[PDB]
Structure formats: C-alpha cells, structure tokens
Amino acid sequence: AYHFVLVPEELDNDYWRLVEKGAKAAAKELGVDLEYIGPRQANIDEHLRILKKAAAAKVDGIITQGLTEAEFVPVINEITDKNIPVVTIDTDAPTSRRVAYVGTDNYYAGFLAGRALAEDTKGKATVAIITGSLTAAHQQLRVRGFEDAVRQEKGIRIVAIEESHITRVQAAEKAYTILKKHPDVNAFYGTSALDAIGVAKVVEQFHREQKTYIIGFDTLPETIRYLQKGTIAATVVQEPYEMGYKAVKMMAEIVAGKDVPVVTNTETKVIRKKDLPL
Numbered sequence: 001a002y003h004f005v006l007v008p009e010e011l012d013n014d015y016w017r018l019v020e021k022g023a024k025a026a027a028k029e030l031g032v033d034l035e036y037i038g039p040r041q042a043n044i045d046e047h048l049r050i051l052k053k054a055a056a057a058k059v060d061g062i063i064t065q066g067l068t069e070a071e072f073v074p075v076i077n078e079i080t081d082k083n084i085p086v087v088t089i090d091t092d093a094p095t096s097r098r099v100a101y102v103g104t105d106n107y108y109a110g111f112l113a114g115r116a117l118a119e120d121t122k123g124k125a126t127v128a129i130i131t132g133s134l135t136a137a138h139q140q141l142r143v144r145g146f147e148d149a150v151r152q153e154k155g156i157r158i159v160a161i162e163e164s165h166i167t168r169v170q171a172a173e174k175a176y177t178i179l180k181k182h183p184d185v186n187a188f189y190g191t192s193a194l195d196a197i198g199v200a201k202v203v204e205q206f207h208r209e210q211k212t213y214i215i216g217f218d219t220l221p222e223t224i225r226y227l228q229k230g231t232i233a234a235t236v237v238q239e240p241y242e243m244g245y246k247a248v249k250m251m252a253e254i255v256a257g258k259d260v261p262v263v264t265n266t267e268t269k270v271i272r273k274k275d276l277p278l
C-alpha cells in the first residue's frame with residue numbers, strides 16, 4: 001500500500017487547501033495513502049525540516065515545492081539519493097534531480113499578468129508590486145515575467161516591490177506603506193493568492209478604487225467578490241485542485257515504472273469580471 005507525502009508552503013493557507021483536495025481525491029482513487037504535512041507558518045527552515053523528516057520515514061514518494069535553488073536543490077538530491085522519488089508541485093527546481101514537475105509555468109503567468117495590465121491601462125501606469133517573497137522561485141519568476149511584458153511600454157513604470165510573506169495582513173500593511181510613500185501609484189500587481197485581497201482592503205479604506213488598478217493571482221472566494229464589485233480588475237487563474245490531483249497520479253505512474261514527462265504545466269490565463277462565473 002503506497003505511502004506518499006505532500007508538503008505545502010503553509011498548512012492552512014487557503015490555496016494549498018485546494019491542492020490538498022485534489023491530491024486526496026487522486027489518492028483515494030488509487031488506494032494510496034496521502035499524508036499532507038507542512039509548516040503552520042511559512043518558514044524555509046521548518047520546510048526543510050519537514051522534508052528531511054518525511055524522507056527518513058520509509059515513504060515511497062515526496063511531493064513538494066522547489067522553493068529556493070540554494071536550499072531545496074541539495075535536499076531534493078538528498079532525498080533522491082535515498083531512492084525516494086520527488087515530484088515538484090506549484091514551484092519547480094528544474095536543476096534538481098526531481099523526476100517531474102506539475103505546476104504553473106510561473107514566468108509565463110507573470111508575463112500574462114503584465115500583458116493584461118498593459119491592455120487594461122492602455123500603456124499608462126505607475127505600478128507597485130506586492131510579492132510573496134523575494135527568495136521564493138515562483139515569486140521571482142512571476143515578477144520577472146511581468147517586468148519583461150511591460151518593458152516596451154514607455155508609460156509603464158514600477159516604483160516599488162514589497163514582500164507579504166503570503167498573509168492578507170502583511171499585504172495590507174505593505175499597501176499602506178507604498179501608498180503613503182508613492183501617492184502617484186495607480187496600479188497594484190500581486191503575485192500570490194492573498195496579495196490582491198490585502199491591497200483591495202486598503203484601497204477600499206481610502207476610497208481610492210477609482211484611481212487604482214488591481215491585478216492579482218488566483219481565484220480564492222474573496223478575490224471573486226472584489227472582482228465582481230470592481231475593486232480588483234483582473235486575476236491570474238491557477239489550477240490548484242488539478243495540480244494536486246495530477247501530482248499524485250504522476251507519482252503513482254513513476255513508482256509503477258511508467259515513462260512520464262518532465263514538466264506538466266497546468267493551465268493559466270487572466271480573467272476579468274466579464275469571465276465570471278466559472
């Protein structure tokens with residue numbers, strides 16, 4: 001009876017709970033034991049601790065983010081040398097010895113965000129970026145993709161980048177700080193699931209909705225509420241359920257000796273109020 005472990009970035013984060021639903025649905029489907037374990041609070045040192053722990057515990061396969069190249073590559077290769085196969089999810093480490101990746105093309109998601117912002121503001125924007133962190137690999141890619149997409153827009157300019165450590169509260173905090181310091185900011189870009197929600201709270205508190213474009217990530221309920229209301233103008237779709245489901249099925253194929261593709265990019269697109277509901 002196969003035993004796999006899935007490690008989220010943070011246990012009770014709303015987006016990861018959707019990943020867990022798809023993983024446990026696939027696990028039930030194959031008669032597989034899925035253990036979902038990860039830090040209470042997103043923390044790179046604990047994250048590495050939960051992985052090395054799960055490795056020494058007889059498990060048949062480990063599904064995890066490849067969060068940072070400097071730390072997670074040695075650990076993944078560590079876990080591989082114990083003849084335990086690793087599947088990366090949501091954030092890839094393409095230089096490690098993980099067998100396969102299931103998750104968004106992160107650069108492209110950020111690139112599609114930049115393209116939408118430039119269409120919506122028609123080339124004119126003073127932009128602040130709220131990102132989950134400056135060291136997480138998917139966050140960097142979503143930032144770099146966005147920069148690349150807007151570089152040709154002479155009238156788009158990025159004035160600030162701050163970290164939210166993927167909470168609502170710290171996204172709101174950073175939006176209070178950016179706005180006080182850059183009152184000409186008329187556009188926000190959030191790169192993780194809770195960022196546009198924190199920005200939207202502050203924009204609504206200041207009655208700034210009419211002079212602030214907000215494009216964020218993912219489709220958590222409150223993002224859809226702000227999207228229908230108007231506070232948020234667009235959001236980059238991800239497929240957390242389907243990537244939780246395909247990561248498990250892909251693990252089951254790997255330990256069954258079957259060939260599998262190295263990368264499987266779940267779908268990503270920018271949606272607006274006109275694409276609701278889904």
Ligand SMILES: OC[C@H]1O[C@@H](O)[C@H](O)[C@@H](O)[C@@H]1O
Pocket residue numbers: 009010013015090091132138166191192193194217218238
């Ligand atoms: O809320 C934080 C989450 O937001 C999502 O956009 C990302 O794909 C996850 O890596 C991240 O942990």
